[PDB]
Amino acid sequence: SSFSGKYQLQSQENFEAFMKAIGLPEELIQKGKDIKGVSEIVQNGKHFKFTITAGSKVIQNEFTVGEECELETMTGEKVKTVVQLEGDNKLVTTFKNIKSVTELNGDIITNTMTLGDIVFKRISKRIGT
Ligand SMILES: CCCCCCCCCCCCCCCC(=O)O
Ligand SMILES: CCCCCCCCCCCCCCCC(=O)O
Ligand SMILES: [Ba+2]
Ligand SMILES: [Ba+2]
Numbered sequence: 001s002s003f004s005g006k007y008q009l010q011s012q013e014n015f016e017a018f019m020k021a022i023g024l025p026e027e028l029i030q031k032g033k034d035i036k037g038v039s040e041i042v043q044n045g046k047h048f049k050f051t052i053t054a055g056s057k058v059i060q061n062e063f064t065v066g067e068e069c070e071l072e073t074m075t076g077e078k079v080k081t082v083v084q085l086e087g088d089n090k091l092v093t094t095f096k097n098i099k100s101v102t103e104l105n106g107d108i109i110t111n112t113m114t115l116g117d118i119v120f121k122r123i124s125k126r127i128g129t
Contacts, residue, residue, distance in 0.1 A: 002043055002088045002089060002104065003043040003089075003091070003102075003109075004041055005040075005126050005129070006038065006039070006040045006041075006128060006129070007038070007040075007041070007107075007124040007125060008036055008038045008125060008127045009035075009036040009037045009038075009122055009124050010123045010124060010125050011122075011123050012120070012122040013119070013120065013121045013122075014120045014121070015032070015120065016029055016033055017118055018115065018118050019032070021115060022074055022075060022096070023075050024074055028057070031055065032054055032057070035054045038053045039051070039109070046064050046065040046085075047062070047063075048063055048091075049061070049062045059072055065083060065084060065085050065091075066082065066083075066084060066085075067082065068080055069081065069082065071083075073095065079096060081094065089103060089105065090102065090103045091103075096115075098113050098114065099113070100112070100113050101113075107126035109123075111123075111124070
């Protein structure tokens, strides 16, 4: 249950640059850049379910650690990949040349996505139960 909970974005870096590079429609970039998105994670052993809500955009994903999964990304593109744990508190995957690291430290989840020189970093904080 390490990751389980509800978290909301506190701050992020390089949203616009990153989203434009990956092919997000620009009117979604514009509507989305200042939204404080909410992430709901449910972990049960190796099985994870996560929902990410950013203003009427709702992305629901599931995966088993160390198994092939199909992740729906920012644009709607579904990608086959493997998510690994690197310790109890860290989720790592790569897709479309993007390295995604999700790290929980107490109540703060730091998500770092790097595509080439672009490092997109999001900091979220637990919000209740
Ligand atoms: C309908 C207007 C809202 C605009 C849609 C917002 C789309 C922006 C997507 C940002 C989500 C960040 C990617 C998830 C990172 C992660 O949790 O792994
Ligand atoms: C929509 C982008 C796909 C995300 C791929 C990463 C899969 C493992 C991480 C799942 C937990 C995500 C936690 C959300 C953190 C955040 O909203 O910034
Ligand atoms: Ba823990
Ligand atoms: Ba991969």
